[PDB]
Design an enzyme around this catalytic site. Structure first.
Site, mmCIF file in Angstrom:
data_model
loop_
_atom_site.group_PDB
_atom_site.id
_atom_site.type_symbol
_atom_site.label_atom_id
_atom_site.label_comp_id
_atom_site.label_asym_id
_atom_site.label_seq_id
_atom_site.Cartn_x
_atom_site.Cartn_y
_atom_site.Cartn_z
ATOM 1 N N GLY A 187 0.837 -1.189 0.000
ATOM 2 C CA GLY A 187 0.000 0.000 0.000
ATOM 3 C C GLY A 187 0.867 1.233 0.000
ATOM 4 N N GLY A 230 4.497 0.893 1.033
ATOM 5 C CA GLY A 230 5.418 0.064 0.280
ATOM 6 C C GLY A 230 4.911 -1.360 0.155
ATOM 7 C CB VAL A 241 5.326 -5.373 4.433
ATOM 8 C CG1 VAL A 241 5.913 -6.060 5.640
ATOM 9 C CG2 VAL A 241 5.475 -3.867 4.570
ATOM 10 C CG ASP A 243 -4.176 -5.480 10.411
ATOM 11 O OD1 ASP A 243 -5.348 -5.142 10.655
ATOM 12 O OD2 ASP A 243 -3.829 -5.932 9.304
ATOM 13 C CG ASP A 252 -1.407 6.882 8.625
ATOM 14 O OD1 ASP A 252 -2.637 7.160 8.717
ATOM 15 O OD2 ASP A 252 -0.949 6.146 7.723
HETATM 16 N N1 LIG Z 1 3.195 -2.169 7.021
HETATM 17 C C1 LIG Z 1 3.730 -3.073 7.841
HETATM 18 N N2 LIG Z 1 4.761 -2.849 8.664
HETATM 19 C C2 LIG Z 1 4.950 -4.069 9.312
HETATM 20 C C3 LIG Z 1 5.869 -4.437 10.291
HETATM 21 C C4 LIG Z 1 5.844 -5.729 10.794
HETATM 22 C C5 LIG Z 1 4.903 -6.630 10.314
HETATM 23 BR BR1 LIG Z 1 4.827 -8.368 11.063
HETATM 24 C C6 LIG Z 1 3.982 -6.296 9.343
HETATM 25 C C7 LIG Z 1 4.020 -5.002 8.854
HETATM 26 N N3 LIG Z 1 3.255 -4.347 7.918
#
Ligand SMILES: Nc1nc2ccc(Br)cc2[nH]1
Ligand SMILES: [Cl-]
Lengths: 267, 9
Positions: free
Chosen positions: A15, A18, A20, A90, A129
């Site tokens: 997104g 970047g 991941v 998340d 954010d």
């Molecule tokens: N955007 C994004 N930063 C992260 C750091 C660690 C992990 Br696990 C997933 C992630 N997604």
């Protein structure tokens, strides 16, 4: 060496931040996340991308912010190696699956986010954010971690006139005037986040709702929690609580410990 | 009611 230190696994997401990937550090099998950011999309730099400056400023043993382990420069991109909790989810996906959170769980999560944001500000970092998408839950330890500092800035006391975070978490003074101050804008986004946790989704989708000044509760929410949310969502920035006032609010008292949170709500 | 992510960056 970069492709020899880490074994790359599946894409976790992509997104504005970047792309991941899941990964493992070859030396000690440590779980990591490998984040790639294209140079042409990096607006702010420091002394490296500002995201790296901010992550280094907040790095420590404290578990509320994601830990930057290493980073690499490539011809067209930067690569960031981040700690990866396992198992993890998340907070956006967690709220989607669970729906509106019990207030005891929202209290624990919100408290940890407040401690993490205080830590950022103590380290001179404004995240800009804060949202459920940018918070990871370490499900075994019951600990939350802020991620995605790519919209952040050095904390200052003068006005901000640039913004690239999430508009539905942005404050009405940004919508109306393209002007905000760091702490009171952070408190606004924390009000949006708290509503999101106790109602199951954010309160506002449209600019007219953000500036309108009316909070309608779509789930049963305690009077104390409603009061705290409406205070964080005060239209006038100087009418919003300080972080001290948030954590001293009656709704915030008797928070669960992280391990209590995991055992009661996550295991 | 539809719940969705929102972009940043
Ligand atoms: N955007 C994004 N930063 C992260 C750091 C660690 C992990 Br696990 C997933 C992630 N997604
Ligand atoms: Cl991150």
């Amino acid at each position: 060496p970069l492709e020899s230190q880490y074994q790359v696994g599946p894409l976790l997401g992509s997104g504005g931040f970047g792309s991941v990937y899941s990964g493992i550090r070859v030396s000690d099998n440590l779980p990591v996340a490998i984040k790639h950011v294209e140079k042409d999309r990096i607006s702010d730099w420091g002394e490296v991308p500002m995201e790296v400056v901010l992550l280094k400023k907040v790095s420590s043993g404290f578990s509320g912010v994601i830990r930057l382990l290493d980073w690499f420069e490539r011809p067209d991109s930067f690569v960031l190696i981040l700690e990866r909790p396992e198992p993890v989810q998340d907070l956006f996906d967690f709220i989607t699956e669970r729906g509106a959170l019990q207030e005891e769980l929202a209290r624990s999560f919100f408290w940890q986010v407040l401690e993490a944001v205080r830590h950022c500000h103590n380290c001179g970092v404004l995240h800009r954010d804060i949202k459920d998408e940018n918070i990871l839950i370490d499900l075994n330890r019951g600990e939350l971690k802020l991620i995605d500092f790519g919209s952040g800035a050095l904390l200052k006391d003068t006005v901000y006139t640039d913004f690239d975070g999430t508009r539905v978490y942005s404050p009405p003074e940004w919508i109306r005037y393209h002007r905000y101050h760091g702490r009171s804008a952070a408190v606004w986004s924390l009000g949006i986040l708290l509503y999101d946790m106790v109602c199951g989704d954010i309160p506002f989708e449209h600019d007219e709702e953000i500036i309108g000044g009316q909070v309608f509760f779509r789930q049963r929410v305690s009077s104390e929690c409603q009061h705290l949310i409406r205070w964080c969502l005060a239209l006038r920035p100087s009418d919003r609580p300080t972080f001290e006032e948030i954590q001293n609010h009656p709704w915030m008292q008797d928070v669960l410990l992280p391990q209590e949170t995991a055992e009661i709500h996550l295991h | 009611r539809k719940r969705r992510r929102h972009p940043s960056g």
